[PDB]
Design a protein around this ligand. Sequence first.
Ligand SMILES: *[C@@H]1O[C@H](CO[C@@H]2O[C@@H](C)[C@@H](O)[C@@H](O)[C@@H]2O)[C@@H](O[C@@H]2O[C@H](CO)[C@@H](O)[C@H](O)[C@H]2NC(C)=O)[C@H](O)[C@H]1NC(C)=O
Ligand SMILES: *[C@@H]1O[C@H](CO[C@@H]2O[C@@H](C)[C@@H](O)[C@@H](O)[C@@H]2O)[C@@H](O[C@@H]2O[C@H](CO)[C@@H](O)[C@H](O)[C@H]2NC(C)=O)[C@H](O)[C@H]1NC(C)=O
Ligand SMILES: *[C@@H]1O[C@H](CO[C@@H]2O[C@@H](C)[C@@H](O)[C@@H](O)[C@@H]2O)[C@@H](O[C@@H]2O[C@H](CO)[C@@H](O)[C@H](O)[C@H]2NC(C)=O)[C@H](O)[C@H]1NC(C)=O
Ligand SMILES: COCCN(C[C@@H]1CCCN(Cc2ccccc2)C1)S(=O)(=O)c1ccc2ccccc2c1
Ligand SMILES: *[C@@H]1O[C@H](CO[C@@H]2O[C@@H](C)[C@@H](O)[C@@H](O)[C@@H]2O)[C@@H](O)[C@H](O)[C@H]1NC(C)=O
Ligand SMILES: *[C@@H]1O[C@H](CO[C@@H]2O[C@@H](C)[C@@H](O)[C@@H](O)[C@@H]2O)[C@@H](O)[C@H](O)[C@H]1NC(C)=O
Ligand SMILES: CC(=O)N[C@H]1[C@H]([C@H](O)[C@H](O)CO)O[C@@](O)(C(=O)O)C[C@@H]1O
Ligand SMILES: *[C@@H]1O[C@H](CO)[C@@H](O)[C@H](O)[C@H]1NC(C)=O
Ligand SMILES: [Cl-]
Length: 526
Amino acid sequence: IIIATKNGKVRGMQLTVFGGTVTAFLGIPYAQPPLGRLRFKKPQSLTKWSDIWNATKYANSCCQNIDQSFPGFHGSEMWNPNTDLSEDCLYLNVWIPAPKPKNATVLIWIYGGGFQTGTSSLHVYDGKFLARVERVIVVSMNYRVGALGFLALPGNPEAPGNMGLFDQQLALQWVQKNIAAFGGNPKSVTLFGESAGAASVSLHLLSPGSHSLFTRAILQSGSFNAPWAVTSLYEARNRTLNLAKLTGCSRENETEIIKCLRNKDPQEILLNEAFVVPYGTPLSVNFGPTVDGDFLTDMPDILLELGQFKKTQILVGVNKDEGTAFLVYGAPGFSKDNNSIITRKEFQEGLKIFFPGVSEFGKESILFHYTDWVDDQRPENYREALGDVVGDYNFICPALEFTKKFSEWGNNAFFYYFEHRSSKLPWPEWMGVMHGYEIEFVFGLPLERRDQYTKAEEILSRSIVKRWANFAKYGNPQETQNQSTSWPVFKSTEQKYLTLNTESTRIMTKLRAQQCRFWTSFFPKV
Ligand SMILES: *[C@@H]1O[C@H](CO[C@@H]2O[C@@H](C)[C@@H](O)[C@@H](O)[C@@H]2O)[C@@H](O[C@@H]2O[C@H](CO)[C@@H](O)[C@H](O)[C@H]2NC(C)=O)[C@H](O)[C@H]1NC(C)=O
Ligand SMILES: *[C@@H]1O[C@H](CO[C@@H]2O[C@@H](C)[C@@H](O)[C@@H](O)[C@@H]2O)[C@@H](O[C@@H]2O[C@H](CO)[C@@H](O)[C@H](O)[C@H]2NC(C)=O)[C@H](O)[C@H]1NC(C)=O
Ligand SMILES: *[C@@H]1O[C@H](CO[C@@H]2O[C@@H](C)[C@@H](O)[C@@H](O)[C@@H]2O)[C@@H](O[C@@H]2O[C@H](CO)[C@@H](O)[C@H](O)[C@H]2NC(C)=O)[C@H](O)[C@H]1NC(C)=O
Ligand SMILES: COCCN(C[C@@H]1CCCN(Cc2ccccc2)C1)S(=O)(=O)c1ccc2ccccc2c1
Ligand SMILES: *[C@@H]1O[C@H](CO[C@@H]2O[C@@H](C)[C@@H](O)[C@@H](O)[C@@H]2O)[C@@H](O)[C@H](O)[C@H]1NC(C)=O
Ligand SMILES: *[C@@H]1O[C@H](CO[C@@H]2O[C@@H](C)[C@@H](O)[C@@H](O)[C@@H]2O)[C@@H](O)[C@H](O)[C@H]1NC(C)=O
Ligand SMILES: CC(=O)N[C@H]1[C@H]([C@H](O)[C@H](O)CO)O[C@@](O)(C(=O)O)C[C@@H]1O
Ligand SMILES: *[C@@H]1O[C@H](CO)[C@@H](O)[C@H](O)[C@H]1NC(C)=O
Ligand SMILES: [Cl-]
């Protein structure tokens, strides 16, 4: 029940899962609380304790604004933090199989939330099912988000940027130093993450200081080359300065600006984060990763293009309707409570919302590419077009490009297209296979027969869980036993991918070929 770690003993707790047992250590601290003079700095090392730390409940989530767009609605509130917010939030969680494994592969989860939100204690991130079913160890950590995790004054150690990424990296280090005492294998560590968590995973593939801290990587609906994932050094300075003005902290000595921000209460930094950008969109990332000269030594597109990244296997994928979620967070004519049949003029207004700083010609060119109808009379033509615009631009085409460029250097890559709409999905049917709604399948929640999932969804989750665990253990996401479709490597020439659904699991080629040539080759010019 008690494990001796390098910094002290921790006590866990037994859980009953599927007529078996999983041992959970929830809320192990992995860094000095980043409080007081430590706000905005890289995370400092933890000094030992002599007692027994009680890791029996999730710890505080990091400070963050909350999505209040749909109070009482499970489809949005399932993503909101479910422990107290606090600056004292640098904790991690460990689920280990019972009986204690001898040398188990480790899966480390990095949550998303646009780098402004998220917490590892969400119900859909519960590691106990993977530990029970596949006898892997699951680790997840809280890392700082928003300005408190990514405020950037480049070169200045008082606020260097990328602190939340260094939070993640310090937790990977904790697993290297400590997971063998839990029965884990530090030489067999796979990172997995979704959305900004997947963008985070991809940046660890680029960061030389993370290279020795993991083996393989899984990227679910995200990568660093997505247009929302990396803040420019220009915007980062303008945003840090605007935050200073907003809080009466404008100074000329930049270090004195940080000292002033260190005396504001967390809630007043949070309230001014929104307005540091003049025209925001539903995908705005106020404070995110930057090229800091430390974690990130050059523009990541250059590093990707020139093969400067960890050479290992990757698993990458996207969902069929990545873009629809964002339409109900600002696009005119849209509502989760009706079928959102919009007109051409609403479509055009919708592009102004998603591409506010883009030239008139740029917006026309999106319209031109996405309105060549196979039928001009379908009432939902425009509703679907805007969704595909948002999802192709922001998730699908960047993930396909990352996979192509990464595989060109000789590593096995595997790409999936997830197209199952959850039977339990609280959002309306027109929104489809939404961003974030593969996660519960990856974590094995449909394996729990009590929870109203269909039988077909148990089978699909069961096969996904097996493929993810085989990728982490062996670098190869096959299900070898139940006459399953074999998953081929993704090569830049043939570009084969695997579709994931309850019906027919098929091999297909060149996902969104025509749409992505527009986003990837032409649109960057406008
Ligand atoms: C636990 O297992 C490791 C081997 O891990 C495997 O090899 C990795 C390279 C990676 O591909 C993982 O996914 C694999 O599961 C053992 O590591 C060995 O350690 C000895 C130490 O003397 C070393 O000489 C060997 O070269 C290591 N093997 C490899 C393949 O590098 C480790 O000893 C095992 N520990 C326990 C307690 O079982
Ligand atoms: C960079 O920052 C300036 C300042 O932003 C304004 O003040 C901040 C404190 C914050 O409250 C923002 O919401 C404000 O917009 C931006 O310049 C402003 O731009 C808006 C609209 O473009 C304009 O109405 C204001 O008059 C401008 N104010 C000043 C002082 O110039 C600027 O757009 C930001 N972005 C870039 C790329 O420079
Ligand atoms: C779908 O709903 C949107 C959103 O309107 C709100 O939600 C509805 C479910 C209902 O509760 C309305 O009373 C709410 O206003 C509708 O978009 C609005 O349309 C009106 C006129 O068409 C326009 O003046 C508003 O600005 C629109 N609001 C927004 C936020 O864009 C839309 O018309 C509905 N579509 C249908 C019923 O097909
Ligand atoms: C208080 O925070 C306001 C801003 N964000 C809220 C999210 C906006 C999108 C919807 N999320 C809920 C949700 C619904 C449906 C399916 C999944 C998820 C809430 S955010 O900071 O979290 C954010 C920012 C920029 C991102 C860019 C790319 C992808 C995700 C992003 C999230
Ligand atoms: C940490 O927890 C210790 C033990 O808690 C008790 O025993 C275990 C087996 C569980 O059954 C738990 O629910 C019980 O409450 C306490 O004795 C100790 O005081 C705790 N330490 C602190 C600092 O709170
Ligand atoms: C594989 O299928 C199991 C149920 O099917 C039965 O068992 C397999 C091994 C075959 O012999 C088949 O003819 C049987 O009908 C599931 O219980 C099991 O979880 C599945 N495994 C995976 C990884 O999906
Ligand atoms: C955010 C925060 O610091 N919460 C703390 C809570 C609350 O202060 C009280 O339960 C009242 O809400 O108290 C603890 O003793 C607990 O019960 O686990 C420690 C925990 O850290
Ligand atoms: C700014 O302040 C710091 C400490 O408060 C000091 O070390 C530094 O020299 C100052 N620089 C300027 C340009 O005032
Ligand atoms: Cl390693």
